[PDB]
Structures are given as structure tokens and as C-alpha cells.
Amino acid sequence: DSTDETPASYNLAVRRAAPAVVNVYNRGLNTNSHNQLEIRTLGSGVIMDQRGYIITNKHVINDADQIIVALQDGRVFEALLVGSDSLTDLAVLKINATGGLPTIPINARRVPHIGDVVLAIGNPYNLGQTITQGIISATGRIGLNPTGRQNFLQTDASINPGNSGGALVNSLGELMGINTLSFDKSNDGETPEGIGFAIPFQLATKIMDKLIRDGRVIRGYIGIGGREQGIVVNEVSPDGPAANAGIQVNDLIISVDNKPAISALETMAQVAEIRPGSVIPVVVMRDDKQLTLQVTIQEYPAT
Amino acid sequence: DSTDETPASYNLAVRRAAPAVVNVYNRGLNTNSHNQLEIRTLGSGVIMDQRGYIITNKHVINDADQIIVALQDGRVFEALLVGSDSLTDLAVLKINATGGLPTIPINARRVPHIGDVVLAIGNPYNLGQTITQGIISATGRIGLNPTGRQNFLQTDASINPGNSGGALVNSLGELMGINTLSFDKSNDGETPEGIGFAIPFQLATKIMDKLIRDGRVIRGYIGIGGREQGIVVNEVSPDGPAANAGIQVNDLIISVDNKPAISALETMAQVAEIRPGSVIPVVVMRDDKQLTLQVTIQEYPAT
Amino acid sequence: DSTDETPASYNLAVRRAAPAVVNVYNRGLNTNSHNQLEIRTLGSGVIMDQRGYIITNKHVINDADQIIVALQDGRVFEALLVGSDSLTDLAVLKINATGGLPTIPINARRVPHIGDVVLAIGNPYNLGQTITQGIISATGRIGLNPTGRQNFLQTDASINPGNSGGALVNSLGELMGINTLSFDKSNDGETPEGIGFAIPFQLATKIMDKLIRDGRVIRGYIGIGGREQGIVVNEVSPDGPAANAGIQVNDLIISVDNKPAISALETMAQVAEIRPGSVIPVVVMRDDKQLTLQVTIQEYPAT
């Protein structure tokens, strides 16, 4: 009836990770503004390392005349847009590294498991830093849009506008992902509950490392469209690889680059890895004939 | 600052129970379809035992030209509708039992407690198997509809369309219930949050066992309507028991079948247990007189 | 594969705190009613001590012709309105103390931490006592309205209509706060998820103690309005302190009452503490001149 007892708490995870999570403000001029900065959109960001590199969502910082980063300790910075990637909806920011910067705990050896308790940390509706608790509902989710699918952690940790670009962490404080999107599909007009997505941390890292190295993310481009044995070529793919190879639409591609092609997704990934300008074999079955065409890859067209 | 630490997780419960939870697809022909199967509605199901008997919601499989059951391991079956019951909104399906089938952990000795952590497992919006975490908010809930009340576990584990017929489990993986309904009542037009209901597992079991034994669920029928000492008879109850007994409306029934009748709910349950065709005493106070009328029960009219 | 295992549960916290949480019914006569009591609004309440003093929200009991308090053990009382305070949205009720009353576990030495697991206990949509689980998302939140800011615990424990005046507790059963408000701001028309506020328990206590001592809450009133070094006076403040002191608007108040005035919030609190009728120094910089005016405080005007 009296308590020397200890309340179940995730405060430790909070104390470890929260300081590294920042408030990102996208400020823009308005014809209305008449020379006065106004907040277009706002969200969150994660301080990845002490050099002052910050991860956030691209849609948070799009078309910004100024980007402001606010730390929980009071410090305010103006940030440099290192680069962004529409495909992953990621963007990297840079800030003054003098003194000390808090960093988000990362553990590359950690395997996120379905059912893991996670906290979402961000700045919903600009109320200030909010911590919500949920679990990992799923992994490898395509998201709301089937096409151009990307791996997503799904979580029922409450996510609202302002949470974008913020962190998802486990009870140990380790970064699990970057909260990006929530599901709103009408489906009879009701409101979807407890369904939000995060870019997995491993992907976040790789993309950040590529945006710091180059102003953008560099991928190989074949310029074809098709749906999932073998794969069918539907897209016109005009110019570039399609012209260089003179590919014929309506054909099925058995294998490419000393590797099998059962699923287009595993294939599309492979295509992106390869450097731009390289030429490799493509195996298609046209009229039940094993035809082979040489083709030059090129850097993925900017979005 | 480094972790050999273990993340708080419900993965164990997930690994124990999830495989037994299936994707249920109700496919129907359309005048539009022109001979092509289209998904009318979709939901989830629980594999109760290795014979391949599956529990799901009735409203999920209603008016199905075909019912498809998809396991998480990839296996797909077409299922036989063993039977359904409007009253509990339950239905049982049967599938090919060759090889091995995963079963949902059941523990009949387990007592669900308010405050127990639970996971909801199902296929919301057909995104794939989703795990949401909540607690048992209440037990013995009537639901949205007061009349014909049934016991419901109430949970704040996020439930969406697609979750119907799926499983609610505790941290040990044990089946707590079958997710059935969520609360949407306007009440000023706002959206109710974290309020969903599940058929308790004990009831699920009893009903499944009755649907496997007979094509339907068999109950005793008195054909009367009334509100809650003694109970008042309001309903016309035309024909059957009411005619056979020639019951007089506006009378109060003190007791029946060697048992007291303080509440109609405890009484209505009793009536359902008794086999159809049996005759027992009914005690009513009409004009302050202890009148007794003999009456023959009959099987509850199909819905 | 078999379980002597123990399900993760918050039942203990439930068993300790729930009995003290009551159903509060605000009943009022209608022109429609024609002499019949109807429920205007309903909510919850917390039994603070065995004398039968109950905390609830003011908006729950406003304009009540009768107030009914229902305990979970079945007991029903009619309650006396001890007092209410618009500022904190709190109200205190009194009921018959004969026999035994359950009390909400309070631990004044306990420090609520961000990330602490908490349960919300209340009567949403009058379904009966509902328990939802969340964490403490934040502390010291102003709420939906910036002006007249009050400290709020923010929680993602599901809160719905009916939860107002009920309790927020930790896993030990200790009272963390009084659920009061949830966030509904359109912000593009979507529905905010997992964002609700509670009056911190410490404040609840102080206010209850003041409402029992006097019919109301007594505060000092300066009658000025201003926004956040030094503070600027904007409000007319007609009569009372402003006239008595003959304060001049557009001036900045450096310090008051042997204490510094960097922020108006820390200052406004101080003003409220001081007893009505007292006179203290006020230091303002007008035209870069350190002018001083004597002024008499008065009891805050009723709302």
C-alpha cells in the first residue's frame, strides 16, 4: 500500500535519444509575406553524428528560403541543405559543430523485430517535443504507394503532422527509423488508426552517407517499366538505355548480369547499384528465342 | 553508452501466435465482374486446431462465391464454410490439412485480466499482417448495440478494417479473443480513439465446437421481449411458445425452471441452453396472482 | 510450448486505482424535459480522500440541476458542489462518507517522468469504466490555448468524451493527473492521434485543498496584459490596480516585489500567490527612466 516501487518507464530511452532529435523549420517568403519569413512547413530531424549532419524528410525542407534547426537544449542554428532524395524522401542538413552536439544512439548490429517496443520522437503540431509509445507492427512494407516500393517499418506509435523526419527508437534508445508517413486512405471514409511508417535506420544511414559524399544519390537507370518465370517490359523507355540497346517492348527478361531475375524488385535494386555508364548483358525470351542485347546503363534521371 | 542490452519486445508472443493468423478473402462475382472474381470484403482468421478449422467473423464471409485463406508461410487454400452464427458474428472455415498447420496457442485455464498487455493480429487494409499493441480495457462489454448483448473484451490495441476475425493475444501468445468490432459512434461528430471489441476466446471455442458438430448453433426460443423484483413481457411472441402457452403480455415472470429470474440476461442465457422441444414451468405474477403456464421451447428461429 | 508463464499486465495498477475512479453524471431539466431529469453531460471523477471529496472537471458539472456520482462497487450518491475554478477547469464534489470509500493512491514525493507508462481511467461514451494504456509524452504543456497557459501532462493514452475528470496513473497505481482535454485542431482537416492532456496531480491537490477551504480559489489580480530584458504592459486594466496605481500602458516592468521579472509567466504566478489587498512596488522603465509606482493588489475577478 506504500511504494518504494519503481514505475514502468521508458525514460531511459528518452534521455538517451531525445536530445539528438531536433525541430526543423522550413521558412519561406510569401507574396503575402512582403519580405517577412513565414513557416511553410515544420517537422523534426535527427542528429546523426557530431559533425552536425542531420537527417530529415525531403518534403519537410522542399522549397525552403531558410531552414532553421532548434535543439532541445535551446540552441538554434540555420542549416545547410547538403542534399535530398525524392525516392527515399530523405534529406541531409548541416549545422555549426562548435562545442558539443548530441547524437542519436545507433547500433548497426541491432535487428529490429516485430513486436519491439518503440518510441516516436518529434514535434507534432509544433507543441514541442512529443514522445509516443508503440511497437513495430511490421517490416519491409511498401507504404501507401505500391509502385516504387521502399522498405518501411510500420508502427502504431502515434504519428502526427510535425513528426516527419523525427526518430523511432527502441527501449534502449537505439535508432530504429525515421518517421516519414502515416496511412490516411479513406476506405469507406473512416480514419485509419495506429498505422504509420518509418524509413529503416540502415537505409537512412546509407542514404545519408551518399548525400554527404555527393550532392545527390547516384543510381543506375535502365528506363523500363514492367510487372513481375520472368519479367515483362512494358514501358517505352524512350532514349538512353532503351534506344542504345534498341529494346523491344513486350519481351520477357530471363536473367541479367550473372544473376537470376525472378522478381523485378530484386532486379531493380541491382540496376540501381551499378555505376552509370557501364554496359552489361540482358537476356530476354522473344518468340521463345534467347536473344541477347548489349546496353549501357546511365545515371538515374533527376526527379 | 554501449548495448549488450535487450530491447523490450513482444516478439515472442508474435512468433508463437502470428503464423496461425490468416488472411481471409471473400470473393464474389459482379454483374460488373462479368465472370471475374472480385474481392467483396477481406479480413483475418485464426487456425484453431490442426484439422484445419478456422475461426473468423460472419460479416467477413457473408454472401461469398468463394472464400480464400492465405497463410503467412505462403500457402493458399480455398475454404469450406462449416457454419456461421449471426448472434455472435462468428463463422468457421475448413481447409486441406495435409502436411502441417500452425495453431493459435490456447490456454483454457487462463483468466484475461483488465490491464493485460495484448497484441492484435490481422490484415488491416490488406497491407499484410499487422501487429498492434494495447491492453484489455474492459470485460463483459455489451458492444455498440445494447439489445442482444454479448460479452466483449474491450481493447485499445489499434483495430482497423481488415482486422475482423483476427486474433487478440497476450504477451505469452495465448489467444484472448477474436477482434470483431470497433466503436465509431459520432457523439458530436468526433472520431472515437482506441476503442475496439473482441469476442472472448472461451465463447469463440464453444461456438466453433457447435458449428463443427452441427451446421449451425442450436438454441432454445421462448419468443418474448422485455426489459429487466421481476421481468416484464412486452413482445407479442406470436405463434410457437407464446401461442402454445397462450402467454399474456404485460405480466411479470418471477421464476422459471427451478431457478430465480432477477435479470432477463441471466434468464435469456438459460433459455438458450435448453434443448428445443422441451417443456418447463413459467411463473408469472398477474394481478398479484401466482399463475403458472406450461410451455414448449423450440429451436431459435434462423436469422 | 506450455505456460506456467505470467502475462505482462498492468492489472495491479488497475486494482489499486480504478475503484476510486467514479462516474460523474450532470443532470439537468429541459424545457423539453417537462420536469424530467436528463443527462446534459457525463464524465469521471477521482475520490481524493475518505471524507468523500472528489475531483472532476468544471466543464463536466457546469449548470447542473443535479450531480450524480456512481462508484464501481454499485454505490450511487448525489454530490454537493464544493467549488469550481475556470482557470484550472477543476471542481470538487462531496458525498456521504458513511461506511468505506476507496481512495486514489497518491504519492507526493513521486516525480512523473517522460516515458513513464500510464493508464487512463474513465467512462468514455458511458460504456463503463475503460482502461487505456499510454506513456507520458511531455510535461509542462500549455495546452491548446497559448494564453493563460497551465501546466499539462501530455499523454498518448487514448482519451475520449467521458474521460474528463478521470485519473491518469502510473504502473504502481499512483495518481499522475486528471484527464481534462484532447487535441482536435484541424491543421488540414485530419484527426490528431494520441494527444491528450491531464492536469498534473500536484496542482490538482493544491486546488482541491483551496476549494475545500473556501468556496472558490483566491488569487491576486494586477489587471494587465502583455507579452514577455523585460515585460511590456498592453492591457487597459481599467479600474482597480491599474487606476489605483495609474499605470501607463506601453511601459516595461523590470522587476517587482524583491524578485526579477524576466518572463511574464513566472511573474503572473507570483502575482496570483499574493493575498488580495496587499500593496507592493512595481519597477518600470519609461523613457529610459526607472519610475516606481505603488499599487494595491485585489482578488482576481470571478469568471
Next chain:
Amino acid sequence: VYQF
């Protein structure tokens, strides 16, 4: 209100 209850039918059985």
C-alpha cells in the same frame, strides 16, 4: 427491449 431484450428478445429471447
Next chain:
Amino acid sequence: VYQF
């Protein structure tokens, strides 16, 4: 904005 704050009145007291």
C-alpha cells in the same frame, strides 16, 4: 497576450 497574457493577462494577470
Next chain:
Amino acid sequence: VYQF
């Protein structure tokens, strides 16, 4: 449906 997939372009790459």
C-alpha cells in the same frame, strides 16, 4: 507497373 515498376519503372527502373
